[PDB]
Write a protein that holds these residues in place. Structure first.
Motif: not given
Ligand code: FMN
Ligand code: OMT
Ligand code: AKG
Ligand code: F3S
Length: 1452
Positions: A1392-1396, A1401-1412, A1428-1433, A1449-1451
């Motif tokens: 695991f790594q933090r999104i870089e 990072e965009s993939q996530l965002k869109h799902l979570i949007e869907e989710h909501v 902003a602050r959150e993606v960080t988490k 690549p993931v990096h």
């Protein structure tokens, strides 16, 4: 089935607690076998408080005065047919309550209405009567139950001495009383109206319905038991049971005063597993321990995340009592506390709700009892090991942490724990200081010869251990003789077969789940389970029963004056009785020693020589351990063995579980060395050498154990989990723990004779080399095999040239040898004169009863696979896809008319290609619970076979290995099977369902349950079948012959009148006409033929199926190699044609004109020592099982337009925990008309208020969308197939979306497409095996994303232990607010790594949007608001093997 519990958090009694308790029991029937009879069920019960108004009045109405105290009641089942006995019974009951001088107001016949009972049950109905007692002695609540307890036992005991049957006291306390019986739970209230009286009020409840492997109803076996109620099974039971035989030898506590002896045996005959548990749990609580302490001492959580207090405690328990393992939801209560608990693997569901009205309702499913969302304060569940509880005296609720906190508090756990001597390091030290060796090759070789060892043994099997630290993998079945019939010295361990588990309970993953397992070993920790003093930690502790000659002596020294050495050996000059007296001797000597003061025993063959044969370590260990138990002495020593014959994992397993504390394979470390001084291991130090050996044997065991879900060696030890084939009944009884040996076999005198013969072989003259060996492979040497060269050639010749005469010469070659298998010991004689062959049934007819087993695409070349599908369809028979997908192109006949599609599709642990369309392209679904090559376990497909086509089929990752989970994740107990079969029959309305099971004793019973679970066919597989890849111990030590299992199923099913409900099939080495007739007579109707069908396609039986080096294109994915394949449909068809003709040839000789006329006809077989009777005996000498509709029934009706016109639709319906598999039928219908993907997402959307029951949306294809406003139970989106499922709390619920459970376990199991959105947490094993579904969920139990191979898995929350284990391929992000994920995740295959990168990072965002969007989730929305602050988490979890494969690549 179900367990449930309810409790008023405040402690104060109420009627609703009981009314709710009923309410529950009215919503579990969807989980059971309904009789056509309308009445019959296996058992239900409700355990509430004795209601003192109700009773007292009663005593008043007769005109006594109500006492001030609490008034007791005995609830009692008397013999109902012999008045003479009812009396004896009542005198006894009275006498006993009388000598404690309490008081009898007297008997009360309980009102009941036997109209709702079935006859089976009214037959065995006891006479239910209450007896009312008073505490004239003015003692205290606590003293009353204590006394009553000693009384009940006293009675229990006397009735027994009287030899009275059918007597039984459900409850007899002044706190609690139990109303259980054999009748449908929905009708508890009808069979017992007292319950409907308002005076029945109570601070708590515990209900429980139960299922069974039976048609017979015993009344006492319905639960709840006296303190307990259990959903599940306790696989570790014989283990536990025998331990108590010693635990007891010392149990003594002061509360029972002089009573203890009446107190034993704490476990009487005739108890069900849970019953025995309640038995132990009780004594312990009666002696002082709270409920929660006891759950722990007996069903402790795994000591893998954990505060240190807890760990202390755990370690404490584990040292006192060895667990009681098996899936287990428990509902418990000593007088005061009320507890819901889990087994150490969270094997069974257990939701719960907490209300504004101050009640907690425990449950197995959740929609089980109406509650207004509005008043829900919480919605939880238990995870592995957790408990939740209520202390009714203080009316306080304790969740897991807080409760465990409390118990940690009670004593100086750690200080006490610190009292143990871990003699580990002391032992590792001496190893590094140098594993010695003192024999000269001239010796090694000759001993080695004594136990008949070989090169195959050294090269094939020992070596890989040393080298790779892993045990030998191999291929093709076990075609050698079964040991008794062998011609060649085989060692005891050969006759003991490893047991394993089939439908009753699941086996574990010892790779992905090794953290819960364990091999700790303790010498001298056997004292007073009854005591609670630090002196209980004073014992030595290893971490493996396994010791290298170094470490062994380390220990043996530290012991010293304390140890004793017994000579496990015997003279050869001895006489016919040499070994017998030998066995006595050892037995006695150990006695004396232990008596004499000794505390450790060392049993050994060391003095083996030209004048002394060695006693078979296994036999010697058992003889000793048993007699030790039989004299209450085993509790005083550790028992350690040194064995010259030991070499593989199996041998350790047997030794251990027949007693052994500790084992040292000394002459094998030797043999290791010798190898090592010829630099066969190369650079590698002999020390690292052993280290490896040792790990191989350690994981060795951990595995063998997991085969019957057992997580821990202490329960396994001495449990005798083997089945003996071949040794005599008398013997096995006399000297080893309890094990079956359904046909006696040899005995001491034979054993002696063979031991000595092999002995002469090795001290009668020089020995420079062991013989080669042909056990794991045919050499032209000694051991024979079924498949040997000649035989293979002739067969090939036969199907290739197409001559039946050649066939016949083959089978003769085959039938004229010495007996090798049980059927070989039977003659077929009949009393009719023969008939003309023409007259018999036809080949066309017969060959149709034949099938080609499931052999996966992967294990076999694509060419071989489809060859088979073509052959079978050509002759109107059936083939079996196999564990691994089937390409859908194949879903049409080709220009030539040939049909590559396979008729029976499997469904196995890793749900390989399992798709709405796959499941629908067949006539039959085979649930694969197991293969005879490797019963306890699950498929392997080496990585280099995981071609890309293969990987595409399976949604796996290319060239990465496919090891399957040993158990199905959605079949942890029989109700579970039951429900899978329902989904299966739901997604495919036309197919029959089969259950592949593997012969073993006990199959019979399961067989029955399978039958009650609506299965249409049951297939029993022999121990000897084939596998493309599998460890060799399973190929030579798991499973039992089909001749035993197949009859047992035939018998038992018959004996319960289910035998006509299901068809029977068998496979395992059937190469010949006669093999097929004999199987029919034993009960079979269908026969499976694999390997011989492979051989006709060309196999030459060279055994390199795991290697991807097939000389012939049969089992290999390699291209060049696949070009050497010459199989042909025509060849296989010839095989079947011959077989059948040879069958007809035989029937005619017998006078029958058909196969049917001979099924079951065992009177036609005579055995021409072993006892083949039990197999031949007859019990009574002289379409598809359809299923109930569901919501889908209406949904479909309501969807006319869909199917008729194409319209798009929105439907609404409520939903109850009682409706299963919702949508699945819809899906089948849609997949059939538009296909998995011809409809655009949401085309048909059905909102549902309420609760979905198991298998919600299972196998939903795209176009369907289910919104469940309310909540769901296990298996949401099981096998999801591109459909969409959303689940959120009710607009009106005040719950914090993410701090509450919302969907059960094993969600999305094996999915391949579609989305799932869940405003809430999910339970254990979330997204297990997901192969391509995208999900968003606000949290998740443990073992999440395990074995995942595709898809995206977001996760707004905390995550359970072992997350991502074996997660080879998909991706999961994971919002982690405490930077904890690090402590929970399972490293091994993932990172695991933090999104870089910013597309991730965009993939996530869109799902979570869907989710909501879908779930209107606040908590989600808010993370969006602070992206902003959150993606960080978050934390990107990405599979190692995916790093270089990934487009972006993931990096960087
Ligand atoms: C090469 C091979 C592949 C097999 N693959 C599967 C499988 O994918 N699924 C399964 O349930 N059993 C599988 N089996 C077992 C067969 O389906 C059947 O139970 C057994 O092969 C027949 O034994 P017999 O080989 O002596 O003819 C496989 C066996 C072999 C030899
Ligand atoms: C519903 S249940 O199948 O869990 C039964 C539990 C237990 N093994 C018994 O024999 O009573
Ligand atoms: O192909 C697979 O996943 C399994 C095949 C298998 O386990 C076997 O044939 O023994
Ligand atoms: S290795 Fe399998 S043994 Fe048959 S398939 Fe090739 S010959």
């Amino acid at each position: 089935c179900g367990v449930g519990f309810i409790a008023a958090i405040d402690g104060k009694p109420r009627r609703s607690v009981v009314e709710k308790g009923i309410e529950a029991l009215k919503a579990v029937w969807h989980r059971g076998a309904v009789d056509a009879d309308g009445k019959t069920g296996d058992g239900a019960g409700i355990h509430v408080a004795v209601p003192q108004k109700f009773f007292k009045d009663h005593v008043k109405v007769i005109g006594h005065r109500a006492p001030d105290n609490k008034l007791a009641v005995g609830q009692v089942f008397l013999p109902r047919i012999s008045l003479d006995a009812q009396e004896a019974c009542r005198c006894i009951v009275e006498t006993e309550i009388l000598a404690f001088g309490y008081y009898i107001y007297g008997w009360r016949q309980v009102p009941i209405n036997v109209d709702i009972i079935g006859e089976k049950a009214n037959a065995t109905r006891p006479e239910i009567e209450q007896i009312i007692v008073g505490n004239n002695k003015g003692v205290s609540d606590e003293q009353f139950e204590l006394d009553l307890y000693i009384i009940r036992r006293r009675i229990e005991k006397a009735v027994k001495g009287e030899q009275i049957n059918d007597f039984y006291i459900c409850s007899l306390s002044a706190r609690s009383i139990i109303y259980k019986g054999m009748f449908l739970a929905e009708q508890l209230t009808t069979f017992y109206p007292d319950l409907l009286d308002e005076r029945f009020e109570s601070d708590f409840a515990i209900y429980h319905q139960r299922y069974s492997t039976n048609t017979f109803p015993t009344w006492p076996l319905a639960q709840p038991f006296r303190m307990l109620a259990h959903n599940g099974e306790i696989n570790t039971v014989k283990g536990n049971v025998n331990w108590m035989k010693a635990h007891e030898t010392r149990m003594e506590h002061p509360a029972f005063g002089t009573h203890m002896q009446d107190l034993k045996p704490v476990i009487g005959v005739g108890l069900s597993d849970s019953g025995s548990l309640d038995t132990v749990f009780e004594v312990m609580v009666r002696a002082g321990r709270t409920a929660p302490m006891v759950k722990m001492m007996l069903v402790p959580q795994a000591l893998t995340t954990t505060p240190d207090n807890h760990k202390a405690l755990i370690q404490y328990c584990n040292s006192v009592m060895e667990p009681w393992d098996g899936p287990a939801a428990l509902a418990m209560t000593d007088g005061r506390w009320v507890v819901g608990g889990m087994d150490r693997n969270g094997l069974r569901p257990m939701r719960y709700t907490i209300t504004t009205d101050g009640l907690i309702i425990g449950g197995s499913e959740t929609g089980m009892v109406k509650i207004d969302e509005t008043q829900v304060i919480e919605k939880g569940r238990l995870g592995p090991g957790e408990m939740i509880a209520v202390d009714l005296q203080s009316g306080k609720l304790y969740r897991d942490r807080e409760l465990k906190d409390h118990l940690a508090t009670l004593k100086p756990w750690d200080k006490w724990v610190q009292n143990t001597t871990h003699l580990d390091e002391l032992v590792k030290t001496a190893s590094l200081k140098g594993e010695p060796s003192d024999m000269d090759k001239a010796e090694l070789r000759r001993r080695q010869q004594a136990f008949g060892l070989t090169m195959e043994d050294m090269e094939l099997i020992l070596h890989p251990m040393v080298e790779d630290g892993k045990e030998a993998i191999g291929s093709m079945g076990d075609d050698s003789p079964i040991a008794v019939l062998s011609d060649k010295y085989r060692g005891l361990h050969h006759f003991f077969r490893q047991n394993f588990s089939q439908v009753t309970n699941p086996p574990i993953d010892s790779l992905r789940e090794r953290r819960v397992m364990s091999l700790k070993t303790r010498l001298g920790n056997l004292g007073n389970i009854l005591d609670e003093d630090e002196t209980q930690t004073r014992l030595l502790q290893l971490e493996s029963p396994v010791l290298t000659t170094a470490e062994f002596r380390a220990m043996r020294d530290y012991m010293g004056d304390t140890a004793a050495e017994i000579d496990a050996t015997f003279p050869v000059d001895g006489g016919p009785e040499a070994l017998r007296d030998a066995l006595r001797r050892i037995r006695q000597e150990t006695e004396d020693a232990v008596r004499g003061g000794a505390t450790h025993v060392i049993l050994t063959d060391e003095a083996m020589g030209p004048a002394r044969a060695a006693i078979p370590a296994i036999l010697a260990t058992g003889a000793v351990h048993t007699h030790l138990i039989r004299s209450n002495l085993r509790t005083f020593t550790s028992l350690n063995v040194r064995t010259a014959e030991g070499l593989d994992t199996h041998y350790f397993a047997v030794l251990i579980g027949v007693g052994a504390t500790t084992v040292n394979a000394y002459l094998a470390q030797e043999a290791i060395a010798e190898r090592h001084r010829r630099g066969l291991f190369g650079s590698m130090p002999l020390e690292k050498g052993m280290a490896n050996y040792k790990k191989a044997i350690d994981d060795g065991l951990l595995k063998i154990m997991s085969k019957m879900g057992i997580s821990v060696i202490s329960s396994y030890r001495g449990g005798g989990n083997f089945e003996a084939i071949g040794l005599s009944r008398a013997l096995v009884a006399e000297h080893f723990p309890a094990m079956v040996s359904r046909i006696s076999g040899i005995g001491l005198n034979g054993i002696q004779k063979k031991v000595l013969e092999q002995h002469a072989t090795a001290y009668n003259e020089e020995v420079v080399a062991l013989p080669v060996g042909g056990f794991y492979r045919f050499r032209k040497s000694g051991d024979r095999h079924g498949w040997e060269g000649g035989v293979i050639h002739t067969l090939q010749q036969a199907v290739t040239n197409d001559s039946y005469t050649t066939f016949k010469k083959y089978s003769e070659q085959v039938n004229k040898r010495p007996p090798m298998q049980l059927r070989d010991l039977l003659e077929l004689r009949s009393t009719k004169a023969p008939v003309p062959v023409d007259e018999v049934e036809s080949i066309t007819a017969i060959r149709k009863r034949f099938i080609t087993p499931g052999m996966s695409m992967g294990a076999l070349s694509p060419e071989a696979h489809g060859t088979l599908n073509v052959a079978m369809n050509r002759i109107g028979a059936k083939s079996d896809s196999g564990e691994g997908g089937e390409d859908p192109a194949r879903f049409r006949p080709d220009k030539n008319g040939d049909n590559w599609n396979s008729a029976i599709k499997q469904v196995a642990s890793g749900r390989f290609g399992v798709t709405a369309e796959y499941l629908n392209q067949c006539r039959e679904l085979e649930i694969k619970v197991a293969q005879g090559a490797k019963p306890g376990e699950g498929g392997q497909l080496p990585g280099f076979k995981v071609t890309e086509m293969i990987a595409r089929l399976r949604h796996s990752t290319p060239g990465v290995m496919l090891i399957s989970p040993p158990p199905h994740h959605d079949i942890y107990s029989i109700e579970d099977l039951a429900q899978l079969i329902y989904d299966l029959k739901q997604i495919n309305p036309d197919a029959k369902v089969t259950v592949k099971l593997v012969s073993r004793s006990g199959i019979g019973t399961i067989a029955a349950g399978v039958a009650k679970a609506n299965a249409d066919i049951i297939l029993i597989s022999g121990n000897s079948g084939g596998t493309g890849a599998s460890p060799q111990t399973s190929i030579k030590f798991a499973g039992l012959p089909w001749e035993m299992g197949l009859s047992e199923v035939h018998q038992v099913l018959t004996l319960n009148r289910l035998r006509h409900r299901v068809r029977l099939r068998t496979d395992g080495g059937l190469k010949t006409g006669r093999d097929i007739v004999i199987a029919a007579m034993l009960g079979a109707e269908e026969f499976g033929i694999g390997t011989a069908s492979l051989i006709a396609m060309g196999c030459i039986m060279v055994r390199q199926c795991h290697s991807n080096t097939c000389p012939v294109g049969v089992c290999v994915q390699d291209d060049k190699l696949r070009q050497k394949f010459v199989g042909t449909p025509e060849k296989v068809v010839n095989l079947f044609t011959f077989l059948a003709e040879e069958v007809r040839e035989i029937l005619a000789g017998l006078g029958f004109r058909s196969l049917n006329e001979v099924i079951g006809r065992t009177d036609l077989l005579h055995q021409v020592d072993l006892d083949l009777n039990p197999r031949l005996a007859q019990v009574d000498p002289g379409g598809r099982n359809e299923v109930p509709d569901t919501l889908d029934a209406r949904i479909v009706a309501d969807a006319r337009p869909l199917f008729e016109e194409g319209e798009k639709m929105q439907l609404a319906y409520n939903a109850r925990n009682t409706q299963r598999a919702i949508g699945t039928r819809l899906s089948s219908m849609v997949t059939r008309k538009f296909g998995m993907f011809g409809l655009q997402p949401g085309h048909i959307t059905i909102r549902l208020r309420g609760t979905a029951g198991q298998s919600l949306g299972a196998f939903a294809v795209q176009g369907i969308k289910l919104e469940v406003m309310g909540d769901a139970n296990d298996y949401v989106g099981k096998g999801l197939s591109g459909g969409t499922i959303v689940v959120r709390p009710t607009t009106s619920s005040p719950l914090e979306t993410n701090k509450n459970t919302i969907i059960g376990n094993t969600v999305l199991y094996g999915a391949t497409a579609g989305k799932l959105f869940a405003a809430g947490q999910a339970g254990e094993r979330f997204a297990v095996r997901n192969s391509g579904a995208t999900v968003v969920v606000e949290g998740c139990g443990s073992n999440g994303c395990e074995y995942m191979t595709g898809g995206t898995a977001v996760i707004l929350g905390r995550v359970g232990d072992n997350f991502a284990a074996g997660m080879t391929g998909g991706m999961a992000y994971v919002y982690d607010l405490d930077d904890s994920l690090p402590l929970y995740i399972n490293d091994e295959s993932v990172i695991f790594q933090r999104i870089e990168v910013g597309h991730y990072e965009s993939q996530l965002k869109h799902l979570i949007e869907e989710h909501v969007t879908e779930t209107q989730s606040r908590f989600a929305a808010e993370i969006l608001n602070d992206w902003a602050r959150e993606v960080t988490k978050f934390w990107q979890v990405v599979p190692k093997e995916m790093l270089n494969r990934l487009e972006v690549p993931v990096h960087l």
